[PDB]
Amino acid sequence: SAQADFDIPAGPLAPALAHFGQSAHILLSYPTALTEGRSTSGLAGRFDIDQGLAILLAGTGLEASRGANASYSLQASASTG
Amino acid sequence: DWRADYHSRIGEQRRLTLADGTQVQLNTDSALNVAFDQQARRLRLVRGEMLITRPALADSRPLWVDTEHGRLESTLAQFNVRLHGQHTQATVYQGSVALQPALHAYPPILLGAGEQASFNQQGLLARQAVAAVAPAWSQGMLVAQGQPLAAFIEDLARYRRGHLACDPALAGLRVSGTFPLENTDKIIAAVAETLQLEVQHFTRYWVTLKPRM
């Protein structure tokens, strides 16, 4: 994907994702309940948008999702076994 | 002395630079009349929504934004003003703005940065903190943080010619996301997919979001 410069401080996850999707200028759409009451360590630096979103989501229990159109979503982290 | 009238079409954002160097961005379907005189730099927001940025730093006259509901007097401020049918909403990002409701102009209500307030001619209607540093529309985006679906689609419809609605059973569903304004059809489709809704679109200018059956 493309890259963007991010300067997102640590804090509650939901406002951080509002900031992320604006800094990346992306269509990001996901269920409100999924991100309520979670937190992020933030994201500061230049990153590919997909890698930056995964870093923002570290520790949250969520991962980024994408489909056939250029939009992004979020989902509970995939089981690995 | 300098005057001008401006308007933006549905779906249009416009950048103006006023005679003093103050920058104004007009959002969709907006109308602004400007009248500078010896007393004041007068902006009249007749319809819609605008962002004032880069205020002139050393003009001796105050900057006044008036709507039918009252006056916003700017002290070096960067701020958004949106006119609704029954109130005006101001959001301050830098500096401070004095709100003077038409029928209760004194004492002014001081809004500092990170504050948003709605008022009518009578006075304040709501007031809250905001973390935004600029309105999302001014960077070509809509941003929703748990916004009720009915209110989200009211906002999005401002950018489109046709009618956009949701079934009443859906009116409070919370919308979260960021949405580039470049393609509003994509916004509708993405929100409907996230909320597991059907998009009824039987005539070009009438779109209803409905429960999946």
Numbering used by the authors:
A (entry chain B): 48 to 128
B (entry chain R): 111 to 323
Q: Which text from the study accompanies this structure?
A:
Here, we report the 1.56 Å resolution X-ray crystal structure of the periplasmic domain of the CSS sigma regulator, PupR, in complex with the NTSD of the transducer, PupB, revealing a unique fold and topological arrangement of domains. The CCSSD comprises two subdomains: residues 110–238 that we call the C-terminal juxta-membrane subdomain (CJM) and residues 250–324, comprising a Secretin/TonB, short N-terminal subdomain (STN). The CJM has a novel-fold, whereas the STN is structurally homologous to the PupB NTSD.
The final Se-Met and native models include residues 111–323 of PupR, residues 49–128 PupB, 20 tartrate molecules, and 355 or 319 water molecules, respectively. The Se-Met and native proteins have practically identical structures, although there are some differences in interacting residues at the complex interface. The interface between the CCSSD and the NTSD has a substantial buried surface area of ∼1438.6 Å2 and involves residues from the linker, β17 and α2 of the CCSSD and α1 and β2 of the NTSD. The interface is stabilized by salt bridges between NTSD His72 and Glu83 to CCSSD Glu292 and Arg284, respectively, as well as an extensive hydrogen-bonding network. Hydrophobic interactions at the interface include two extensively buried residues, NTSD Leu74 (84% buried) and CCSSD Met251 (98% buried). Interestingly, a polar interaction linking NTSD His72 and CCSSD Glu292 is critical for interaction between the two proteins, but the atoms involved are variable. The Glu292 side chain adopts a different conformer with the closest atom, Oϵ2, shifting 4.7 Å from His72. These results suggest that in addition to the complementary surfaces, a polar interaction at this position is critical to the interaction.
